Amino acid sequence: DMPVERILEAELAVEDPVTNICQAADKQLFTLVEWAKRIPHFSELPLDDQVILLRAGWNELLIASFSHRSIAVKDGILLATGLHVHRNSAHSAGVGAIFDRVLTELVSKMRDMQMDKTELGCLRAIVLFNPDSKGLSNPAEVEALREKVYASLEAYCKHKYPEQPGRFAKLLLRLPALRSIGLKCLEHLFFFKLIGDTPIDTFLMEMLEAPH
Amino acid sequence: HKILHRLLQD
Ligand SMILES: O=C(O)c1ccc2c(c1)N[C@@H](c1cc(C(F)(F)F)cc(C(F)(F)F)c1)[C@@H]1[C@H]3CC[C@H](C3)[C@H]21
């Protein structure tokens, strides 16, 4: 069973600009592990599968979180360290294009539909339970968990926002943008690592290591 | 995966 109440509880429990952004990402990776443990049935997966899902999903999971945290911010993002970063500062640091994609495709769309924390948590749990992740011992089990999340999300949307029949589809259709933005952010991080001019802390660096 | 494994202990 996959109650939206548990998914919401998990969200509530865990609540150079590039250098600050990377520092916040390292900090949030620790919190991300604690979040995943609070998602129903994640901790009952084999340890190797928990590792695979987190290594596959961490960037999208963290992007979804900071995007939603930023819904009341004008033209900027709020990092988990408390620092607001405006798009002017991101442009001035050479990451303007990807930052504008975050604002236009994620933050602004979350704001305009007033995406709530239950919906965010369910989208994040869908991302976490990614049955396409390579190396999973039992992909069908992860697929089944994803199916329970989206069934619960749809029921939640139909009950809470009955006047918005397209809302569930609208939520799911931010996932391709999240996927593309995550991939582009990952390219940037690998580049910062290659250049060597941006401090990258130990957990963020481990996520940039090759898989076993 | 050293840090991640350690943080996933129960
Ligand atoms: O504070 C947080 O909750 C938090 C947690 C995690 C993160 C962040 C913020 N920032 C992300 C980010 C954003 C941009 C934006 F949005 F500003 F354009 C540009 C860049 C770039 F790589 F290009 F520098 C990187 C990093 C990347 C690793 C996991 C996510 C993605 C990570």
PDB file of C-alpha atoms and ligand atoms in Angstrom:
ATOM      1  CA  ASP A   1       0.000   0.000   0.000  1.00  0.00           C
ATOM      2  CA  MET A   2       1.198   3.523  -0.888  1.00  0.00           C
ATOM      3  CA  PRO A   3      -0.670   6.172   1.150  1.00  0.00           C
ATOM      4  CA  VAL A   4      -0.193   9.783   0.060  1.00  0.00           C
ATOM      5  CA  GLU A   5      -0.218  10.714   3.761  1.00  0.00           C
ATOM      6  CA  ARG A   6       3.089   8.867   4.202  1.00  0.00           C
ATOM      7  CA  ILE A   7       4.577  10.551   1.140  1.00  0.00           C
ATOM      8  CA  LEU A   8       3.589  13.979   2.478  1.00  0.00           C
ATOM      9  CA  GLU A   9       5.050  13.128   5.899  1.00  0.00           C
ATOM     10  CA  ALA A  10       8.349  12.320   4.169  1.00  0.00           C
ATOM     11  CA  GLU A  11       8.420  15.730   2.462  1.00  0.00           C
ATOM     12  CA  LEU A  12       7.616  17.509   5.720  1.00  0.00           C
ATOM     13  CA  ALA A  13      10.221  15.572   7.711  1.00  0.00           C
ATOM     14  CA  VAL A  14      13.161  16.649   5.544  1.00  0.00           C
ATOM     15  CA  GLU A  15      12.438  20.392   5.190  1.00  0.00           C
ATOM     16  CA  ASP A  16      30.470  32.141  -7.278  1.00  0.00           C
ATOM     17  CA  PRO A  17      26.852  30.955  -7.159  1.00  0.00           C
ATOM     18  CA  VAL A  18      27.972  27.611  -8.598  1.00  0.00           C
ATOM     19  CA  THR A  19      30.101  26.891  -5.530  1.00  0.00           C
ATOM     20  CA  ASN A  20      27.144  27.627  -3.228  1.00  0.00           C
ATOM     21  CA  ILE A  21      24.863  25.522  -5.416  1.00  0.00           C
ATOM     22  CA  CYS A  22      27.282  22.580  -5.240  1.00  0.00           C
ATOM     23  CA  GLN A  23      27.692  23.005  -1.477  1.00  0.00           C
ATOM     24  CA  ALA A  24      23.911  22.839  -1.063  1.00  0.00           C
ATOM     25  CA  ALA A  25      23.701  19.781  -3.315  1.00  0.00           C
ATOM     26  CA  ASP A  26      26.216  17.912  -1.165  1.00  0.00           C
ATOM     27  CA  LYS A  27      24.260  18.823   1.989  1.00  0.00           C
ATOM     28  CA  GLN A  28      20.951  17.734   0.460  1.00  0.00           C
ATOM     29  CA  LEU A  29      22.321  14.356  -0.658  1.00  0.00           C
ATOM     30  CA  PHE A  30      22.473  13.324   3.013  1.00  0.00           C
ATOM     31  CA  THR A  31      18.894  14.496   3.521  1.00  0.00           C
ATOM     32  CA  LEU A  32      17.823  12.688   0.342  1.00  0.00           C
ATOM     33  CA  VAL A  33      18.835   9.336   1.841  1.00  0.00           C
ATOM     34  CA  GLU A  34      16.669  10.037   4.887  1.00  0.00           C
ATOM     35  CA  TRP A  35      13.764  11.078   2.647  1.00  0.00           C
ATOM     36  CA  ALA A  36      13.916   7.855   0.607  1.00  0.00           C
ATOM     37  CA  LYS A  37      13.902   5.736   3.782  1.00  0.00           C
ATOM     38  CA  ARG A  38      10.593   7.397   4.665  1.00  0.00           C
ATOM     39  CA  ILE A  39       8.938   6.454   1.352  1.00  0.00           C
ATOM     40  CA  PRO A  40       6.799   3.314   1.843  1.00  0.00           C
ATOM     41  CA  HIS A  41       8.573   0.084   0.854  1.00  0.00           C
ATOM     42  CA  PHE A  42      11.852   1.675  -0.305  1.00  0.00           C
ATOM     43  CA  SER A  43      13.828   0.356   2.675  1.00  0.00           C
ATOM     44  CA  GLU A  44      12.502  -3.169   2.035  1.00  0.00           C
ATOM     45  CA  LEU A  45      14.159  -3.285  -1.388  1.00  0.00           C
ATOM     46  CA  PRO A  46      17.541  -5.058  -1.511  1.00  0.00           C
ATOM     47  CA  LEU A  47      20.369  -2.760  -0.451  1.00  0.00           C
ATOM     48  CA  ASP A  48      21.917  -2.936  -3.935  1.00  0.00           C
ATOM     49  CA  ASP A  49      18.619  -1.789  -5.474  1.00  0.00           C
ATOM     50  CA  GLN A  50      18.289   1.127  -3.026  1.00  0.00           C
ATOM     51  CA  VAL A  51      21.788   2.189  -4.133  1.00  0.00           C
ATOM     52  CA  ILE A  52      20.880   1.878  -7.825  1.00  0.00           C
ATOM     53  CA  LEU A  53      17.682   3.929  -7.472  1.00  0.00           C
ATOM     54  CA  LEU A  54      19.345   6.735  -5.503  1.00  0.00           C
ATOM     55  CA  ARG A  55      22.358   6.917  -7.818  1.00  0.00           C
ATOM     56  CA  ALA A  56      20.004   7.002 -10.807  1.00  0.00           C
ATOM     57  CA  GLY A  57      17.573   9.544  -9.399  1.00  0.00           C
ATOM     58  CA  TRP A  58      19.406  11.911  -7.059  1.00  0.00           C
ATOM     59  CA  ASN A  59      19.865  14.813  -9.481  1.00  0.00           C
ATOM     60  CA  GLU A  60      16.225  14.860 -10.619  1.00  0.00           C
ATOM     61  CA  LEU A  61      15.072  14.386  -7.018  1.00  0.00           C
ATOM     62  CA  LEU A  62      17.120  17.346  -5.788  1.00  0.00           C
ATOM     63  CA  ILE A  63      16.079  19.549  -8.738  1.00  0.00           C
ATOM     64  CA  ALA A  64      12.395  18.856  -8.104  1.00  0.00           C
ATOM     65  CA  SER A  65      12.854  19.801  -4.443  1.00  0.00           C
ATOM     66  CA  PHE A  66      14.640  23.109  -4.923  1.00  0.00           C
ATOM     67  CA  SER A  67      12.322  24.045  -7.780  1.00  0.00           C
ATOM     68  CA  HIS A  68       9.259  23.616  -5.589  1.00  0.00           C
ATOM     69  CA  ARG A  69      10.931  25.415  -2.676  1.00  0.00           C
ATOM     70  CA  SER A  70      11.343  28.387  -5.028  1.00  0.00           C
ATOM     71  CA  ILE A  71       7.696  28.894  -6.069  1.00  0.00           C
ATOM     72  CA  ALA A  72       7.385  32.177  -4.154  1.00  0.00           C
ATOM     73  CA  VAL A  73      10.768  33.468  -5.376  1.00  0.00           C
ATOM     74  CA  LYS A  74      10.775  35.985  -8.212  1.00  0.00           C
ATOM     75  CA  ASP A  75      13.160  34.965 -11.005  1.00  0.00           C
ATOM     76  CA  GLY A  76      15.357  32.857  -8.748  1.00  0.00           C
ATOM     77  CA  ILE A  77      15.836  29.795  -6.578  1.00  0.00           C
ATOM     78  CA  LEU A  78      16.067  29.207  -2.840  1.00  0.00           C
ATOM     79  CA  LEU A  79      18.849  26.821  -1.852  1.00  0.00           C
ATOM     80  CA  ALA A  80      18.496  24.522   1.132  1.00  0.00           C
ATOM     81  CA  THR A  81      21.310  26.472   2.826  1.00  0.00           C
ATOM     82  CA  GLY A  82      19.025  29.528   3.005  1.00  0.00           C
ATOM     83  CA  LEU A  83      20.659  31.437   0.139  1.00  0.00           C
ATOM     84  CA  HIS A  84      18.480  32.908  -2.599  1.00  0.00           C
ATOM     85  CA  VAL A  85      20.119  32.891  -6.040  1.00  0.00           C
ATOM     86  CA  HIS A  86      18.747  35.291  -8.654  1.00  0.00           C
ATOM     87  CA  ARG A  87      18.895  34.561 -12.370  1.00  0.00           C
ATOM     88  CA  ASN A  88      21.159  37.597 -12.835  1.00  0.00           C
ATOM     89  CA  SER A  89      23.739  35.952 -10.568  1.00  0.00           C
ATOM     90  CA  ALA A  90      23.467  32.648 -12.433  1.00  0.00           C
ATOM     91  CA  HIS A  91      23.879  34.416 -15.769  1.00  0.00           C
ATOM     92  CA  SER A  92      26.912  36.263 -14.398  1.00  0.00           C
ATOM     93  CA  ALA A  93      28.448  32.883 -13.445  1.00  0.00           C
ATOM     94  CA  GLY A  94      28.078  31.328 -16.896  1.00  0.00           C
ATOM     95  CA  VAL A  95      25.128  29.030 -16.108  1.00  0.00           C
ATOM     96  CA  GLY A  96      22.337  31.337 -17.283  1.00  0.00           C
ATOM     97  CA  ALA A  97      20.811  29.015 -19.881  1.00  0.00           C
ATOM     98  CA  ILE A  98      20.219  26.012 -17.622  1.00  0.00           C
ATOM     99  CA  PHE A  99      19.070  28.314 -14.811  1.00  0.00           C
ATOM    100  CA  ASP A 100      16.456  29.865 -17.083  1.00  0.00           C
ATOM    101  CA  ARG A 101      15.239  26.374 -18.025  1.00  0.00           C
ATOM    102  CA  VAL A 102      14.719  25.576 -14.334  1.00  0.00           C
ATOM    103  CA  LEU A 103      12.751  28.791 -13.910  1.00  0.00           C
ATOM    104  CA  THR A 104      10.615  28.511 -17.054  1.00  0.00           C
ATOM    105  CA  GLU A 105       9.993  24.760 -17.229  1.00  0.00           C
ATOM    106  CA  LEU A 106       9.842  23.885 -13.511  1.00  0.00           C
ATOM    107  CA  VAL A 107       9.536  26.740 -10.970  1.00  0.00           C
ATOM    108  CA  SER A 108       7.088  28.834 -12.980  1.00  0.00           C
ATOM    109  CA  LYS A 109       4.906  25.877 -13.943  1.00  0.00           C
ATOM    110  CA  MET A 110       4.819  24.620 -10.350  1.00  0.00           C
ATOM    111  CA  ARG A 111       3.811  28.133  -9.311  1.00  0.00           C
ATOM    112  CA  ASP A 112       1.120  28.579 -11.970  1.00  0.00           C
ATOM    113  CA  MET A 113      -0.666  25.315 -11.119  1.00  0.00           C
ATOM    114  CA  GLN A 114       0.024  25.714  -7.369  1.00  0.00           C
ATOM    115  CA  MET A 115       1.537  22.231  -7.190  1.00  0.00           C
ATOM    116  CA  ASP A 116       1.238  21.111  -3.560  1.00  0.00           C
ATOM    117  CA  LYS A 117       3.657  19.150  -1.381  1.00  0.00           C
ATOM    118  CA  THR A 118       1.722  15.889  -1.657  1.00  0.00           C
ATOM    119  CA  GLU A 119       1.895  16.166  -5.447  1.00  0.00           C
ATOM    120  CA  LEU A 120       5.601  17.044  -5.316  1.00  0.00           C
ATOM    121  CA  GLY A 121       6.270  14.115  -2.998  1.00  0.00           C
ATOM    122  CA  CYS A 122       4.438  11.721  -5.308  1.00  0.00           C
ATOM    123  CA  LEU A 123       6.293  12.973  -8.375  1.00  0.00           C
ATOM    124  CA  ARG A 124       9.543  12.502  -6.450  1.00  0.00           C
ATOM    125  CA  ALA A 125       8.525   8.983  -5.389  1.00  0.00           C
ATOM    126  CA  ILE A 126       7.720   8.201  -9.047  1.00  0.00           C
ATOM    127  CA  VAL A 127      11.214   9.432  -9.984  1.00  0.00           C
ATOM    128  CA  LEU A 128      12.751   7.384  -7.154  1.00  0.00           C
ATOM    129  CA  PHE A 129      10.980   4.152  -8.185  1.00  0.00           C
ATOM    130  CA  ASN A 130      12.448   4.203 -11.694  1.00  0.00           C
ATOM    131  CA  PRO A 131      12.133   0.668 -13.152  1.00  0.00           C
ATOM    132  CA  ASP A 132      14.375   1.578 -16.077  1.00  0.00           C
ATOM    133  CA  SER A 133      17.390   1.918 -13.741  1.00  0.00           C
ATOM    134  CA  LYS A 134      20.092  -0.466 -14.916  1.00  0.00           C
ATOM    135  CA  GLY A 135      21.162  -3.376 -12.733  1.00  0.00           C
ATOM    136  CA  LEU A 136      18.014  -3.717 -10.604  1.00  0.00           C
ATOM    137  CA  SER A 137      17.635  -7.225  -9.184  1.00  0.00           C
ATOM    138  CA  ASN A 138      13.852  -7.127  -9.765  1.00  0.00           C
ATOM    139  CA  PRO A 139      12.672  -4.334 -12.082  1.00  0.00           C
ATOM    140  CA  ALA A 140       9.054  -5.540 -11.940  1.00  0.00           C
ATOM    141  CA  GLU A 141       8.948  -4.873  -8.186  1.00  0.00           C
ATOM    142  CA  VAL A 142      10.112  -1.286  -8.681  1.00  0.00           C
ATOM    143  CA  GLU A 143       7.591  -0.891 -11.502  1.00  0.00           C
ATOM    144  CA  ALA A 144       4.840  -2.102  -9.169  1.00  0.00           C
ATOM    145  CA  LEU A 145       5.820   0.460  -6.527  1.00  0.00           C
ATOM    146  CA  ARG A 146       5.799   3.228  -9.144  1.00  0.00           C
ATOM    147  CA  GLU A 147       2.340   2.067 -10.254  1.00  0.00           C
ATOM    148  CA  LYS A 148       1.067   2.308  -6.674  1.00  0.00           C
ATOM    149  CA  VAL A 149       2.445   5.854  -6.364  1.00  0.00           C
ATOM    150  CA  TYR A 150       0.794   7.115  -9.528  1.00  0.00           C
ATOM    151  CA  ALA A 151      -2.511   5.412  -8.724  1.00  0.00           C
ATOM    152  CA  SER A 152      -2.443   7.135  -5.319  1.00  0.00           C
ATOM    153  CA  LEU A 153      -1.474  10.454  -6.902  1.00  0.00           C
ATOM    154  CA  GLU A 154      -4.323  10.290  -9.392  1.00  0.00           C
ATOM    155  CA  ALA A 155      -6.852   9.500  -6.655  1.00  0.00           C
ATOM    156  CA  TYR A 156      -5.492  12.400  -4.599  1.00  0.00           C
ATOM    157  CA  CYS A 157      -5.816  14.812  -7.529  1.00  0.00           C
ATOM    158  CA  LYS A 158      -9.355  13.676  -8.344  1.00  0.00           C
ATOM    159  CA  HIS A 159     -10.415  14.132  -4.704  1.00  0.00           C
ATOM    160  CA  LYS A 160      -8.626  17.389  -3.858  1.00  0.00           C
ATOM    161  CA  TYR A 161      -8.931  19.163  -7.233  1.00  0.00           C
ATOM    162  CA  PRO A 162     -12.065  17.651  -8.808  1.00  0.00           C
ATOM    163  CA  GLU A 163     -12.587  20.759 -10.949  1.00  0.00           C
ATOM    164  CA  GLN A 164      -9.188  20.191 -12.669  1.00  0.00           C
ATOM    165  CA  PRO A 165      -9.524  16.896 -14.587  1.00  0.00           C
ATOM    166  CA  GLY A 166      -6.257  17.480 -16.453  1.00  0.00           C
ATOM    167  CA  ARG A 167      -4.186  18.040 -13.317  1.00  0.00           C
ATOM    168  CA  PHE A 168      -2.788  14.507 -12.981  1.00  0.00           C
ATOM    169  CA  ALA A 169      -1.607  14.499 -16.598  1.00  0.00           C
ATOM    170  CA  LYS A 170      -0.177  18.005 -16.102  1.00  0.00           C
ATOM    171  CA  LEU A 171       1.896  16.776 -13.157  1.00  0.00           C
ATOM    172  CA  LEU A 172       3.230  13.750 -15.048  1.00  0.00           C
ATOM    173  CA  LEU A 173       4.101  15.912 -18.063  1.00  0.00           C
ATOM    174  CA  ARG A 174       6.665  17.893 -16.087  1.00  0.00           C
ATOM    175  CA  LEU A 175       8.753  14.707 -15.790  1.00  0.00           C
ATOM    176  CA  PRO A 176      10.319  14.921 -19.293  1.00  0.00           C
ATOM    177  CA  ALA A 177      11.449  18.467 -18.560  1.00  0.00           C
ATOM    178  CA  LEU A 178      12.845  17.324 -15.201  1.00  0.00           C
ATOM    179  CA  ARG A 179      14.692  14.492 -16.971  1.00  0.00           C
ATOM    180  CA  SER A 180      16.229  16.826 -19.568  1.00  0.00           C
ATOM    181  CA  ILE A 181      17.171  19.466 -16.982  1.00  0.00           C
ATOM    182  CA  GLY A 182      18.704  16.816 -14.734  1.00  0.00           C
ATOM    183  CA  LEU A 183      20.850  15.533 -17.598  1.00  0.00           C
ATOM    184  CA  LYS A 184      22.062  19.028 -18.446  1.00  0.00           C
ATOM    185  CA  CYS A 185      22.842  19.813 -14.806  1.00  0.00           C
ATOM    186  CA  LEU A 186      24.840  16.574 -14.643  1.00  0.00           C
ATOM    187  CA  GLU A 187      26.899  17.632 -17.686  1.00  0.00           C
ATOM    188  CA  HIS A 188      27.683  20.925 -15.939  1.00  0.00           C
ATOM    189  CA  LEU A 189      28.804  19.147 -12.758  1.00  0.00           C
ATOM    190  CA  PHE A 190      31.128  16.834 -14.683  1.00  0.00           C
ATOM    191  CA  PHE A 191      32.538  19.902 -16.397  1.00  0.00           C
ATOM    192  CA  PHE A 192      33.106  21.736 -13.092  1.00  0.00           C
ATOM    193  CA  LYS A 193      34.948  18.632 -11.905  1.00  0.00           C
ATOM    194  CA  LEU A 194      37.067  18.536 -15.071  1.00  0.00           C
ATOM    195  CA  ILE A 195      38.016  22.222 -14.912  1.00  0.00           C
ATOM    196  CA  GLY A 196      38.871  22.046 -11.206  1.00  0.00           C
ATOM    197  CA  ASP A 197      37.829  25.627 -10.398  1.00  0.00           C
ATOM    198  CA  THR A 198      34.745  24.727  -8.317  1.00  0.00           C
ATOM    199  CA  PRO A 199      34.908  22.969  -4.923  1.00  0.00           C
ATOM    200  CA  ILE A 200      32.966  19.688  -4.933  1.00  0.00           C
ATOM    201  CA  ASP A 201      32.440  17.947  -1.576  1.00  0.00           C
ATOM    202  CA  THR A 202      32.678  14.222  -0.857  1.00  0.00           C
ATOM    203  CA  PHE A 203      29.122  12.957  -1.381  1.00  0.00           C
ATOM    204  CA  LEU A 204      28.536  14.995  -4.520  1.00  0.00           C
ATOM    205  CA  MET A 205      31.898  13.695  -5.771  1.00  0.00           C
ATOM    206  CA  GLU A 206      30.889  10.098  -5.025  1.00  0.00           C
ATOM    207  CA  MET A 207      27.738  10.576  -7.094  1.00  0.00           C
ATOM    208  CA  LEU A 208      30.035  11.629  -9.972  1.00  0.00           C
ATOM    209  CA  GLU A 209      32.051   8.411  -9.683  1.00  0.00           C
ATOM    210  CA  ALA A 210      31.567   5.601 -12.158  1.00  0.00           C
ATOM    211  CA  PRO A 211      29.118   2.887 -11.049  1.00  0.00           C
ATOM    212  CA  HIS A 212      30.300  -0.443  -9.701  1.00  0.00           C
TER     213      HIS A 212
ATOM    214  CA  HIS B   1      29.176   4.181  -3.210  1.00  0.00           C
ATOM    215  CA  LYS B   2      30.987   4.081   0.142  1.00  0.00           C
ATOM    216  CA  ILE B   3      29.168   7.052   1.668  1.00  0.00           C
ATOM    217  CA  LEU B   4      25.795   6.035   0.218  1.00  0.00           C
ATOM    218  CA  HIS B   5      26.076   2.459   1.531  1.00  0.00           C
ATOM    219  CA  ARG B   6      26.984   3.695   5.010  1.00  0.00           C
ATOM    220  CA  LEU B   7      24.017   6.083   5.136  1.00  0.00           C
ATOM    221  CA  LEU B   8      21.597   3.332   4.068  1.00  0.00           C
ATOM    222  CA  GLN B   9      22.341   1.204   7.156  1.00  0.00           C
ATOM    223  CA  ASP B  10      19.199   0.462   9.178  1.00  0.00           C
TER     224      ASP B  10
HETATM  225  O1  LIG C   1      19.684  23.766  -2.340  1.00  0.00           O
HETATM  226  C1  LIG C   1      19.162  22.731  -2.799  1.00  0.00           C
HETATM  227  O2  LIG C   1      18.112  22.196  -2.404  1.00  0.00           O
HETATM  228  C2  LIG C   1      19.879  22.082  -4.033  1.00  0.00           C
HETATM  229  C3  LIG C   1      20.071  20.699  -4.012  1.00  0.00           C
HETATM  230  C4  LIG C   1      20.696  20.131  -5.113  1.00  0.00           C
HETATM  231  C5  LIG C   1      21.137  20.863  -6.215  1.00  0.00           C
HETATM  232  C6  LIG C   1      20.979  22.260  -6.296  1.00  0.00           C
HETATM  233  C7  LIG C   1      20.330  22.803  -5.154  1.00  0.00           C
HETATM  234  N1  LIG C   1      21.484  22.872  -7.512  1.00  0.00           N
HETATM  235  C8  LIG C   1      21.611  22.145  -8.834  1.00  0.00           C
HETATM  236  C9  LIG C   1      21.987  23.085  -9.973  1.00  0.00           C
HETATM  237  C10 LIG C   1      21.086  24.068 -10.336  1.00  0.00           C
HETATM  238  C11 LIG C   1      21.364  24.942 -11.357  1.00  0.00           C
HETATM  239  C12 LIG C   1      20.278  26.006 -11.664  1.00  0.00           C
HETATM  240  F1  LIG C   1      19.075  25.596 -11.312  1.00  0.00           F
HETATM  241  F2  LIG C   1      20.530  27.033 -10.893  1.00  0.00           F
HETATM  242  F3  LIG C   1      20.266  26.409 -12.909  1.00  0.00           F
HETATM  243  C13 LIG C   1      22.560  24.919 -12.062  1.00  0.00           C
HETATM  244  C14 LIG C   1      23.468  23.937 -11.701  1.00  0.00           C
HETATM  245  C15 LIG C   1      24.854  23.813 -12.432  1.00  0.00           C
HETATM  246  F4  LIG C   1      25.300  22.571 -12.362  1.00  0.00           F
HETATM  247  F5  LIG C   1      24.788  24.155 -13.698  1.00  0.00           F
HETATM  248  F6  LIG C   1      25.772  24.586 -11.894  1.00  0.00           F
HETATM  249  C16 LIG C   1      23.193  23.035 -10.665  1.00  0.00           C
HETATM  250  C17 LIG C   1      22.509  21.025  -8.463  1.00  0.00           C
HETATM  251  C18 LIG C   1      22.793  19.917  -9.483  1.00  0.00           C
HETATM  252  C19 LIG C   1      23.107  18.545  -8.814  1.00  0.00           C
HETATM  253  C20 LIG C   1      21.736  18.094  -8.203  1.00  0.00           C
HETATM  254  C21 LIG C   1      20.927  19.362  -8.337  1.00  0.00           C
HETATM  255  C22 LIG C   1      21.321  19.683  -9.835  1.00  0.00           C
HETATM  256  C23 LIG C   1      21.809  20.214  -7.380  1.00  0.00           C
END
